[PDB]
Design a protein around this ligand. Structure first.
Ligand code: NA
Ligand code: NA
Ligand code: NA
Ligand code: NA
Ligand code: NA
Ligand code: NA
Ligand code: NA
Ligand code: NA
Ligand code: NA
Ligand code: NA
Ligand code: NA
Ligand code: NA
Ligand code: NA
Ligand code: NA
Ligand code: NA
Ligand code: NA
Ligand code: NA
Ligand code: NA
Ligand code: NA
Ligand code: NA
Ligand code: NA
Ligand code: NA
Ligand code: NA
Ligand code: NA
Ligand code: NA
Ligand code: NA
Ligand code: NA
Ligand code: NA
Ligand code: NA
Ligand code: NA
Ligand code: NA
Ligand code: NA
Ligand code: NA
Ligand code: NA
Ligand code: NA
Ligand code: NA
Ligand code: NA
Ligand code: NA
Ligand code: NA
Ligand code: NA
Ligand code: NA
Ligand code: NA
Ligand code: NA
Ligand code: NA
Ligand code: NA
Ligand code: NA
Ligand code: NA
Ligand code: NA
Ligand code: NA
Ligand code: NA
Ligand code: NA
Ligand code: NA
Ligand code: NA
Ligand code: NA
Lengths: 370, 370
């Protein structure tokens, strides 16, 4: 059923159109129609010193085509035009064939930092030769994840120079559908004593890394000039300027911040809708943006002149989750996951990166157009 | 009146204690007591494709001492223990004298990117000699801010090399209590034609920069070892390990992301409470974290061994606002500003950076303790 006029329709009419799309079960549609909120009692369980609740808008971005599957995407944002722009971007890219996306890996990285290591090279050697035993020790400490087919998968050790020197042990862990912060905290605590013994050093801390390079996800889109503007040669102008806009963000940190901000107008909105920790996704992606020695734009837009196409691409660390307290307790979050056809964390991650690149597309097109 | 037991008190008892503190007017206390939310109708004005609203917890972090003034800080977070940790951090630092903070500048930066500039050096020369006229042209285009004592204050031009070369013009603008994105969009549009004429180039875009280096704010705290632990020599151990934790984050991007994530658990929570754009604050701070060539921790913790003190310090771009749509329309946001004694954007910024450093303190202390 057509989605056009959805923006101009009234709140009641939007709800009836959504109902007509038959995306939600009777209970979820009713829940949405009485705008069921998470209660103070439930809020009081999630957080501390709770004295009430706080509301933001809940919107829909329809027609998000990811790998030939269409989604109606939920957004939570307080910013005017963020949703309109994501919706507009999404429709264009759908006409153009939607997004093509891949998950390169899905693992969480945990680290233990050791210091007062007399012989870092010898220590590094011992720990790395004891790798399989150490992985077994982490997996025994958290047997709940091995039974579900995940667990600790790899281990490496780095000498990091400085004031003072640190010997850092990284574990790589399949956490399946979970974020993994508690899991990795427990696994890493089990390893501390043996790591101290083997290194003859003191363990400083054992903690998940929000720099999730074992969970990179890339999205691309391929947009023919005729979808950018029907007027003759105007599509090429627009695409040219978007490519220049992309180059500008590679060149100037002052542009790149803003460029990457716009991407996260979309990303944080759906992360909130899905009960995901946006602080974590923000940190990893913004760290990723500075990996080649300077802070740069997270996406790139280039031209295919023979095919007459605008190409957009983006890789982000996206260790999102489909289970967790907020997902279990906030009834709108459960609704959001149902609305999305209950994607696995992998599929959700591919939708989120796509949303990011859509949001970016509308931002650049608006900025560079007369 | 004492705040202890506030965490363990019931939701009703917390509200009665808050009432006893007399921090809110009768209307605001009543508004909070019936948990007045922003309505769907109001939500529908803020955002697009609105089909409902979305709720998160609303909590209090009491006893935040900033420059000898105590605040009860509002938080909006879905993460267990974030509030408890901020509250715990805040009480310790209050005993220790609270935070000392300063605003170095408060200005917004806008940029126009020019390309196809044949002679960038000549163009740079012309624009810079025409500086005062250009500033006047921006101020005429937005007279609403000059009457309130703000406006365009400075202009500079940079040659940024790459593929291709860009000539970028930056304006620096006092936007008073406002974020300034609309203001700077309008001012920069007024400048485009003349900038093109003077440079003999094409303007790509005119846009606010979320890399807000003209709005840096620093907070510090000075914590005696005896406040970290009453046991003999245990305070020194803890402080030593926090300093090492700080060094770890300077050395390893994998730690720094997580380190900076924790800071923003606090910052984003109060930014939501106050109707502020957290995507913008995230982008600028995370870009700031990579300014010295590598992605590093945003705060530093060092020891004063003679004075027996743990010192924490943090500088962040904090161009927050005290006016704007969300602030005008979401009744809990208005409440949050009233709760805080209606601080100016400058004072709010100093509270937010302090909150960040408090959140960081509890994170590090927990990670490095037995
Ligand atoms: Na309406
Ligand atoms: Na209606
Ligand atoms: Na919390
Ligand atoms: Na509590
Ligand atoms: Na309440
Ligand atoms: Na929304
Ligand atoms: Na995983
Ligand atoms: Na970490
Ligand atoms: Na993460
Ligand atoms: Na990770
Ligand atoms: Na990866
Ligand atoms: Na992934
Ligand atoms: Na591709
Ligand atoms: Na750009
Ligand atoms: Na951002
Ligand atoms: Na953008
Ligand atoms: Na969330
Ligand atoms: Na959420
Ligand atoms: Na990330
Ligand atoms: Na991450
Ligand atoms: Na870019
Ligand atoms: Na993933
Ligand atoms: Na939630
Ligand atoms: Na609901
Ligand atoms: Na699910
Ligand atoms: Na956008
Ligand atoms: Na936009
Ligand atoms: Na309660
Ligand atoms: Na109660
Ligand atoms: Na919006
Ligand atoms: Na609308
Ligand atoms: Na509703
Ligand atoms: Na909260
Ligand atoms: Na300003
Ligand atoms: Na910009
Ligand atoms: Na900003
Ligand atoms: Na700025
Ligand atoms: Na400054
Ligand atoms: Na400032
Ligand atoms: Na100081
Ligand atoms: Na740290
Ligand atoms: Na963050
Ligand atoms: Na932290
Ligand atoms: Na907000
Ligand atoms: Na808000
Ligand atoms: Na910032
Ligand atoms: Na900023
Ligand atoms: Na640090
Ligand atoms: Na400020
Ligand atoms: Na709001
Ligand atoms: Na309220
Ligand atoms: Na105010
Ligand atoms: Na914390
Ligand atoms: Na913590």
């Amino acid at each position: 059923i057509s989605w056009n006029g959805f923006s101009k329709k009234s709140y009641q009419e939007r709800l009836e159109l959504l109902k007509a799309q038959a995306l939600l079960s009777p209970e979820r549609q009713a829940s949405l129609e009485k705008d069921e909120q998470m209660s103070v009692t439930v809020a009081d369980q999630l957080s501390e010193n709770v004295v009430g609740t706080f509301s933001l808008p809940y919107s829909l971005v329809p027609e998000v085509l990811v790998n030939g599957q269409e989604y109606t995407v939920p957004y939570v944002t307080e910013e005017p035009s963020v949703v309109a722009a994501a919706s507009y971007a999404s429709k264009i890219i759908k006409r153009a064939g939607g997004f093509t996306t891949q998950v390169h890996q899905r693992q969480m990285i945990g680290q233990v930092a050791l210091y007062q290591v007399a012989n870092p090279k010898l220590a590094q050697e011992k720990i790395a030769s004891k790798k399989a035993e150490l992985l077994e020790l982490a997996n025994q400490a958290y047997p709940s994840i091995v039974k579900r087919g995940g667990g600790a998968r790899d281990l490496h050790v780095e000498q990091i120079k400085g004031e003072p020197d640190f010997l850092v042990v990284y574990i790589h862990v399949d956490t399946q559908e979970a974020m993994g912060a508690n899991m990795l905290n427990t696994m890493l605590e089990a390893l501390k004593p043996v790591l101290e013994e083997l290194s003859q050093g003191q363990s400083l801390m054992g903690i998940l890394s929000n720099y999730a390079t074992d969970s990179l996800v890339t999205a691309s889109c391929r947009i023919a000039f005729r979808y950018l503007s029907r007027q003759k040669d105007q599509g090429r102008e627009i695409a040219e300027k978007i490519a220049l806009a992309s180059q500008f963000a590679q060149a100037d940190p002052y542009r790149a911040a803003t460029h990457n901000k716009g991407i996260f107008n979309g990303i944080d909105a759906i992360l909130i809708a899905t009960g995901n920790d946006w602080r974590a996704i923000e940190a990893g992606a913004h760290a990723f943006a500075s990996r080649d020695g300077r802070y740069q734009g997270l996406s790139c837009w280039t031209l295919d002149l023979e095919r007459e196409e605008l190409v957009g691409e983006m890789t982000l660390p996206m260790p999102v989750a489909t289970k967790g307290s907020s997902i279990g307790l906030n009834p709108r979050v459960a609704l959001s996951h149902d609305l999305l056809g209950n994607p696995s964390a992998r599929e959700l991650a591919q939708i989120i990166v796509s949303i990011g690149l859509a949001q970016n597309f509308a931002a650049l097109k608006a900025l560079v157009s007369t």
